[PDB]
Ligand binder design. Structure first.
Ligand SMILES: [Mg+2]
Ligand SMILES: [Mg+2]
Lengths: 131, 293, 784, 146, 242
RNA sequence: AGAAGCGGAUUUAGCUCAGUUGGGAGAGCGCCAGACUGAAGAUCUGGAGGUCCUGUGUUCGAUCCACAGAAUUCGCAUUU
RNA sequence: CCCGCUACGGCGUGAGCGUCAAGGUCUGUUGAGUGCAAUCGUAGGACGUCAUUAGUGGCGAACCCGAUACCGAUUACUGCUGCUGUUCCAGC
């Protein structure tokens, strides 16, 4: 008569100072994955590298990351631990985690990708409720 | 409201002179702490116990809140406090504590040995106890001593910015912090960011996750930044401006003037606060029956 | 890595085991502990750091050296005389009770003055100085008197002048202060008896006084509260005609045997209160009783104190020919239990004459066994005051190291009736117990006699036929409770009692510990395990209901178990009913008998029973349950004191053939007493429900009794347990405690005899308080 | 006031990897073949330096920071190859999983580590180790007598 | 009492003859299993689905528990069961279950295909499902294909012996096992030791800690290792005997 | 980071420690200054420097006396 | 001290008894009994409080924790209950 926590969303925002770097450098999608594997490799080991995270709704220095519930803080302690260095950017960057929620309800813009992600989640929630 | 009370000043000895690059770097990291969000900042200054101290009054303060940070305040909208962390190692040479205490707002300590840690909690009137998280802990804390020190006042302080320095220092940092949480009984824990750069700044929800992964709960962490952080500010702020928490030169208005919140409206020259005639004994009765304010 | 030989391997591993054992012993020796902590946990003294005299003498030197290494008031003009009044009263009271004479009644009542007490104690000494007659002169130095009330009840005893207003409301044991220093007492009746020892002794008394074999000790209970009456036939000097009749009137035809007349053994059984006014006899279950006879005619009857007051009132109602003798403060027994209780008891006493009873008791004291002896073991003799010894010593002869049943049968053949019954006649008569105090000495006097023996001549004081107080002493076996009780006069008990546990393997019993002993031996107890009787039902139901209701309204909301909203209790949940059977507290025998008569009315109305839908037409269960709830709501306003509701069946099944108007509760329901042992996982608790095995599910519980579990290898009961209906209840467990002598759970229950003859098998399920699981077990009949 | 730290007993077992050499099938014989001996360069500091390197390369840095708060080897002797590691009750999972992934020492390879007993006190672990070694002596004596 | 059910037989094809070193290696690793302490042993053998099954009765099993291991069964005090993992990718050259289930005891499968998972959950009355924890994840695990198969009775198996092979394989191992844990709803997880050498065997205390830190609770892990393992053993035993 | 329970001792300037019919708040060292030396140490003089652990209450007045709340620290046949 | 051999005190057994001594031991330990000081982890169900976008989510704590046991008093925190005092607001 309860509901098992599947995972949890995490809202990141890369705060980048030194405006010349913010105007010149442009982070692409592979750099996100490489830097997150480097961050989970510097502070954690193999088991911290094998944390399940995928990329959803990537914008210009803006990321939504889904991480399983039983290792929630295991993710969010490391994101506030590691500092980017010597990876295609001359200056290090800062990370601001804006909000955390386990119930799918965030409001960023009136964009239509969020409704598509909500439909993808409901297509799995109906299979979880029925089967 | 959020308090960050351990931002270090780029100077260790009075013979050294701070360059303009470090000052501009501190301006940029204060703009960084203003960018995402914070409410209070208390910048820290390191003082060794056996140095040659100057016998001055208006030269014990190399902070200058009025001339440079008073110009930063109008575009910032925040406030800065100044404090001394006493790096006390041996009972050989000392100081005149009544001048160093009444100079700044908050008084802290940094023990290295056994007896200094006892006489700091016993006799020395300070506000916070900071340990060397970068190096080895002096002794392992007894429960009934730290509990009685929290019941007397002074709380323990955890510097989560010191783990961001090196790789090897993280193990000693966590080994110190878990011992502090174990022997402090989760009463006197105040956290602060010891960053020297804007490149090592964090957000509230990441620091909360750090405190989660260290061993202390989440609600007790946010309560430590709401209740426990701003009260130990008020302790030193009333001790060094006013008498020993007895009679205050801070104007009690409705919601704008406070001892903590209104620093600029208090004349920081000696004590006083110039306030216009808001109290008239002639024709002012109950507050709900007035018509002029 | 390289392969090694066998001998080198076993030598290296044995050296490693020796090194680990030596390291553990060295760590235990290097752990900084005092020699104060070297004492066992029973003998640890907190005040031993203050004064050294608590420590053993071998260890006191180390205590002194480590203690050396580690290191007349303002009184006004009125309160000074207020303090000197008590000191003068104590001095004059000591001199008055010591020199010659007895106590005046005005000092005993202590409700008029203290200056009149001083004047009376001053006047008695002057009257003893000026004249020999007109003196109530005693027979000893210590202040002992004869508190024996002929044909009336014994009043409040005189005791001591200092501790007199402390005896104003409740009386004391003769060992009151001694037990008070070492135990927790509760004030329930007119006495103040022990309840529990201060140190924890659940498993300790369970192993040493219990039915376990490893019982190397002795356990002593102060049972002075058990009241006795002595009845003798004054009408005829010949054979007792009215004695057998009054025994058959007080008890049933169960304790009036010719065998108990011939073999004169004490019997403990069930007494019921009779009442015959004019042509009608009303019998109510009263309680326990102990009956003992002297060869034909005189009888001592001892039992529970409120039941003692009621039996004394009924006996004083019909007191026409026989003379009654109330003994509340002149005779009392103490109860020894264990394996070495007989050895410590023979250690505490010595002989004053070569007789047969001494030889029988000394051979009984060496076998270290209880149940191998026959049913009758009632020994009596004359012995010395145990203040002569004052040291733990045992006396044992050679005896060639042989113990057989042939010598036990030889002592069974030859029984010294005359001397034992003469000691009985000495203890029943008030003149002989008064003559027993003719040579009672003070502790100063026996210390002076010990000093005289140390100067002239061994650690003893010799016996003299002229000037030593030869006491009567009676030690008898009590059968069903498996314990030896020894009876003695009131002021003689403490010189016997103080020397008992100075034997280093003898401890004291509390009333909760006595309840544990009665629980272990599958026996029964009157305030708790007797719900059928009037006083037991009243006391148990009222006190446990009020205590549990105060505790329930005392706890806040959301921390205690909530009895109101418990889902899935029974199959087909009945409307207007969401809680547990009856009230959630102490046993509702009223609910059980109304539900039993409701199911009986349903069986008399039709061959089957329906499940669900001024008295409404009873056709199913919930109409009976609403009548139960209405009767409970009516009796919450006015208390019930009219009649009982559940008697026993074991006296009714044998002779009365257990035979059972718009009636729902007039004719009560009879029960048999059972002891059910858990075969399934779990333990019972107090006030536990007892249900039938279902007839549709009987094969499933038989398979669970044989065996069924998951293929892992360990026992499984995480299965869909089938829930029976509400009306399958048959009993209540009052006492629930984890039975350590069996390794399982024991529950003392009381089930209906008609329901007992319903099932062909003894498999009966148990359900706890506020717990929705069902646990099968098997019962054995309690013939008590 | 006291600290609730758990101790973990581990034993170094050498699997007899001999492909050309035959084997004898028995209980105490294979106890002799697994409980052979510890090699020469095995001490407290060597096992600590190896387990800290395994903690670094396997579990990382901040996990190594949580584990290395009270990561000490209290008792170890090379004659029996049994050791007791002190740890916290929370990171006992991490310490046992670090003991599992111990592959080889820098000097001698071909070995496994068996974590046997975990308790919050060391005195009952020593009492269990004496009883377990007594059972080993029982098996050895049963196969030696017959 | 414990059940270990994933020890491989050093042979892949029936044309290859097992050398004398491989038999001795298997004896050494099973004696290492009995050394650390295990009760049940079910040794595994790999059969490709593209391989042509022989039409024999007493020659389907090249394991021979009776002639080789029948002495170690008496001397050591254990027992051996036989089982087959089926490397199935495409529905071709197959659909035969009435003969292979009678000879062997436990029938397992190894789907690496998207349609292979569907044909395994649909028309294969097998005991255990095994995934390749060594190589990458096939497509994606969902709750829809797993929950419909676990409720039927088929258990999902995790191979903790494949983790002690390489350094790079450990990351893909954790990424596969945590996906199996989040998709399995912590119910149908049976774990086994896939060791080919005696240098790669562990005890219950380390493996329980491993599966506990990978994401399965301590109740479900130990309850699985006892009950579900000894239940699927009698599932195979009643498919044999009845 | 070696508890738990028991007795004894004890908190005063930055430090180490006195001291008290109950009526003044100190000594040595240290800091600063004077004196002195070519310079420095030593010696010598002077000044700065106080939450007398905190609180109650007694008294006319508390380092002191009474109570309450903290603790400091030794010993438990020890150098872990 | 009793039995057998031997006879100046002697010797062998009783799983015998009494006294004396010993830093040999005290899990002889307690419905918890540790002593480099255990009092666990997880899942499901019942109840209470608080917030919701469809109905669920979070929380059951704070103080603190045995070492022989008992009881009185004091101190640290949450909730309930009665009394008292203060402030604010009205029914006429
Ligand atoms: Mg304590
Ligand atoms: Mg205490």
């Amino acid at each position: 008569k309860k509901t098992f926590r599947e995972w949890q969303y995490f809202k990141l925002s890369i705060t980048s100072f030194d405006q010349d770097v913010d105007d010149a450098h442009a982070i692409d999608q592979m750099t996100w994955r490489q830097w997150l594997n480097n961050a989970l490799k510097r502070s954690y080991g193999i088991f911290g590298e094998g944390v399940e995270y995928s990329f959803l709704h990537v914008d210009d220095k803006l990321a939504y990351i889904r991480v399983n519930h039983a290792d929630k803080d295991t993710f969010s302690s490391s994101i506030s631990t590691y500092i980017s260095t010597d990876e295609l950017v001359g200056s290090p960057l800062t990370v601001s985690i804006l909000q955390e929620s386990s119930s799918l309800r965030l409001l960023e813009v009136t964009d239509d990708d969020r409704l598509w992600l909500k439909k993808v989640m409901e297509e799995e929630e109906q299979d979880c409720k029925c089967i | 409201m959020l308090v960050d009370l351990n931002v270090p000043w780029p100077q260790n000895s009075y013979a050294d002179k701070v360059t303009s690059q470090a000052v501009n770097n501190l301006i940029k990291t204060l703009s960084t702490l203003h960018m995402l969000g914070y409410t209070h900042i208390a910048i820290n200054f390191t003082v060794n116990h056996s140095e040659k101290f100057p016998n001055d009054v208006k030269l014990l303060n190399p902070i200058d809140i009025k001339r440079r940070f008073g110009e930063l305040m109008d575009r910032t909208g925040l406030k800065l406090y100044s404090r001394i962390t006493l790096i006390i190692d041996d009972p050989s040479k000392g100081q005149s504590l009544s001048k160093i205490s009444q100079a700044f707002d908050i008084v802290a300590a940094l023990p290295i040995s056994e007896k200094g840690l006892t006489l700091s909690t016993t006799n020395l009137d300070i506000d916070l106890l900071t340990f060397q998280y970068g190096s080895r802990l002096p002794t392992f804390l007894k429960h009934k001593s730290i509990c009685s020190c929290v019941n007397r006042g002074v709380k323990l302080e955890i510097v989560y910015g010191y783990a961001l320095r090196d790789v090897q220092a993280r193990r000693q940092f966590v080994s110190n912090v878990r011992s502090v949480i174990r022997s402090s009984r989760s009463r006197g824990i105040v956290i602060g960011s010891g960053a020297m750069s804007p490149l090592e700044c964090r957000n509230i929800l990441g620091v909360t996750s750090l405190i989660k992964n260290l061993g202390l709960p989440s609600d007790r962490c946010s309560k430590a930044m709401g209740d426990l952080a701003s009260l130990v500010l008020l302790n030193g702020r009333l001790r060094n401006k006013s008498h020993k928490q007895t009679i205050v030169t801070g104007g009690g208005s409705g919601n704008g003037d406070d001892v903590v919140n209104d620093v600029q409206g208090i004349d920081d020259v000696q004590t006083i606060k110039v306030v216009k005639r808001s109290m008239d004994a002639e024709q002012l009765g109950h507050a709900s029956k007035r018509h002029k304010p | 890595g390289s392969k090694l030989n066998v001998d080198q391997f076993i030598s290296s591993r044995q050296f490693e085991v020796k090194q680990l054992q030596l390291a553990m012993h060295n760590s235990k020796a290097a752990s900084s502990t005092r020699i104060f902590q070297a004492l066992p946990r029973k003998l640890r003294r907190r005040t031993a750091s203050h004064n050294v005299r608590r420590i053993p003498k071998r260890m006191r030197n180390r205590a002194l050296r480590e203690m050396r290494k580690s290191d007349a008031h303002g009184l006004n003009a009125k309160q000074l005389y207020k303090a000197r009044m008590s000191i003068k009263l104590l001095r004059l009271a000591s001199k008055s009770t010591s020199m010659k004479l007895s106590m005046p009644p005005e000092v005993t009542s202590s409700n008029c003055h203290v200056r009149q007490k001083i004047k009376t104690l001053k006047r008695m000494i002057k009257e003893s100085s000026t004249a020999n007659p007109n003196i109530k002169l005693l027979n000893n130095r210590m202040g002992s008197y004869d508190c024996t009330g002929v044909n009336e009840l014994a009043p409040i005893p005189k005791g001591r002048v200092k501790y007199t207003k402390r005896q104003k409301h409740f009386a004391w044991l003769p060992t009151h202060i001694w037990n008070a220093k070492r135990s927790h007492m509760m004030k329930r009746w007119g006495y103040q008896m022990v309840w529990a020892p201060t140190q924890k002794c659940f498993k300790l008394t369970h192993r040493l006084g219990g039915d376990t074999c490893s019982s190397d000790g002795a356990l002593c209970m102060d049972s002075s509260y058990i009241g006795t009456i002595i009845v003798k036939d004054k009408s005829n000097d010949s054979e007792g005609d009215f004695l057998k009749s009054i025994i058959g009137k007080l008890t049933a035809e169960r304790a009036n045997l010719r065998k108990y007349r011939e073999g004169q053994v004490l019997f403990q059984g069930l007494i019921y209160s009779f009442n015959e006014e004019n042509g009608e006899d009303s019998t109510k279950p009263l309680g326990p009783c102990d009956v003992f006879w002297v060869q034909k005619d005189t009888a001592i009857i001892r039992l529970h104190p409120s039941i003692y007051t009621q039996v004394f009132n009924i006996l004083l109602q019909h007191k026409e020919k026989l003379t009654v003798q109330d003994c509340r403060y002149s005779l009392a027994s103490v109860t020894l239990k264990g394996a070495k209780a007989l050895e410590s008891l023979a250690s505490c006493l010595r002989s004053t004459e070569y007789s047969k009873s001494f030889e029988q008791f000394k051979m009984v004291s060496m076998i270290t066994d209880h149940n191998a002896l026959p049913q009758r073991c009632t020994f009596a003799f004359e012995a010395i005051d145990p203040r002569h010894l004052a040291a733990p010593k045992k006396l044992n002869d050679s005896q060639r190291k042989t113990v057989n049943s042939d010598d036990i049968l030889s002592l069974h053949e030859n029984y010294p009736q005359d001397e034992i019954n003469a000691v009985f006649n000495e203890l029943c008569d008030p003149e002989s117990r008064t003559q027993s105090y003719n040579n009672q000495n003070t502790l100063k006097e026996i210390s002076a006699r010990r000093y005289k023996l140390l100067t002239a001549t061994k650690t003893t004081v010799p016996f003299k036929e002229s000037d030593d107080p030869s006491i009567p002493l009676v030690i008898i076996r009590r059968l069903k409770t498996r314990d030896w009780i020894v009876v003695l006069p009131w002021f003689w008990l403490l010189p016997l009692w103080h020397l008992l546990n100075r034997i280093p393997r003898m401890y004291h019993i509390g009333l909760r510990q006595f309840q544990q002993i009665q629980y272990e031996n599958k026996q029964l107890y009157f305030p708790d395990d007797y719900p059928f009787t009037q006083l037991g039902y009243i006391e148990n139901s009222f006190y446990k209901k009020e205590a549990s209701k105060t505790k329930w309204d005392r706890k806040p909301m959301g921390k205690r178990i909530n009895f109101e909203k418990i889902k899935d209790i029974h199959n087909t949940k009945l409307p207007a009913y969401s809680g547990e059977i009856g009230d959630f507290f102490s046993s509702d025998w009223r609910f059980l008998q109304i539900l039993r008569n409701g199911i009986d009315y349903l069986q008399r109305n039709d061959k089957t029973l329906e499940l669900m839908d001024g008295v409404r037409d009873i056709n199913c269960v919930n109409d009976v349950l609403e009548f139960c709830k209405d009767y409970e709501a009516k009796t919450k306003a006015m208390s019930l004191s009219i009649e009982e509701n559940i008697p026993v069946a074991l006296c009714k099944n044998r002779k009365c053939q257990f035979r059972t108007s718009f009636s729902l509760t007039f004719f009560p329901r009879c029960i048999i007493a059972v002891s059910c042992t858990l075969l399934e996982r779990g333990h019972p608790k107090d006030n536990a429900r007892i249900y039938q095995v279902p007839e549709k599910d009987l094969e499933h519980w038989l398979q669970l009794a044989k065996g069924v579990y998951r293929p892992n290898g360990r026992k499984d009961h995480d299965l869909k347990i089938p829930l029976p209906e509400v009306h399958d209840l048959i009993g209540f467990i009052t006492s629930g405690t984890y039975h350590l002598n069996c390794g399982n759970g024991m529950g003392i229950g009381f089930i209906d005899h008609h329901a007992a003859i319903r099932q062909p098998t003894r498999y009966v399920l148990i359900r706890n308080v506020g717990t929705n699981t069902y646990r099968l077990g098997e019962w054995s009949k309690i013939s008590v | 006031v006291r600290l609730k730290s758990r101790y973990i007993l581990f034993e170094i077992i050498f699997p007899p990897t001999d492909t050309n050499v035959e084997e004898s099938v028995s209980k105490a014989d294979i106890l002799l073949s697994h409980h052979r001996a510890s090699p020469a360069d095995v001490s407290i500091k060597s096992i600590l330096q190896e387990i800290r390197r395994s903690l670094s390369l396997n579990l990382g840095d901040y996990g190594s920071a949580k584990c290395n708060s009270l990561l000490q080897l209290k008792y170890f002797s090379n004659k029996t190859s049994t050791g007791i590691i002190r740890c916290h009750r929370e990171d006992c999972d991490l310490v046992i999983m670090a003991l599992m992934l111990m592959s080889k020492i820098g000097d001698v390879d071909g070995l496994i580590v068996n974590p046997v007993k975990v308790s919050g006190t060391i005195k009952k672990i020593e009492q269990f180790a004496m009883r377990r070694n007594s059972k080993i002596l029982n098996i050895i004596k049963c196969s030696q007598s017959s």
